[PDB]
Symmetry: C3
């Protein structure tokens, strides 16, 4: 009779609410995983930027160090050359 | 009577189609977010490759510049040495 | 009569199980895509670490090479200077 139909209505309502809430919590799973992976890429981008910046900074420092040493060596070499020249006099 | 049962059938059909289309559009949300995050990682990979390539290129250029300068300095130092030696004669 | 109602029950059960299994397999799609993108970021992180490590290693090697050459050049220059000084005697 209609009683078995009503029991079917209740159990389809139950399973429908079940899949509803399950889907909702699994969407929560997916969205928190999006949040965490986006944070992962954000920190990775920050790491790449920091690495690039400090590598370029050290390249700059080494460049100016080489230039400084070259200048100093030329200058004192000329200085000792003139020193010896005067010592000859 | 069966009329209330029929109204229940219509409203469960309504809510079922509702959750159906909602799930579909939210899956669309998730898949476009996959597409955009994959593009993000793609462009990040391209950025890392470009950074590595230009850093290695500048390292190469600095290496050959140092070698060139060393060679030039040795050569002209020897040249001026021979110049002064001949000037002594 | 109740027969059309029963047919409606069967077809809503069918469509409900259909959306159930479809959602489940599409969640499988989403989770394997999470797995593969997490592996992508993992290998990208490993690549960034390897690049940074070998660049810093080559910077170290170039630094010690420059220091070695500077030391060697100072030393042998002083040596030949003393050599010529003694040759004058």
């Amino acid at each position: 009779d209609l009683k078995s139909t009503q029991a079917a209505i209740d159990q389809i309502n139950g399973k429908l609410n079940r899949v509803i809430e399950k889907t909702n919590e699994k969407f929560h799973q997916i969205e928190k995983e999006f949040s965490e992976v986006e944070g992962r890429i954000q920190d990775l981008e920050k790491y790449v930027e920091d690495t690039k910046i400090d590598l370029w900074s050290y390249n700059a420092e080494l460049l100016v160090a080489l230039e400084n040493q070259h200048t100093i060596d030329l200058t004192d070499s000329e200085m000792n050359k003139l020193f010896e020249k005067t010592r000859r006099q």
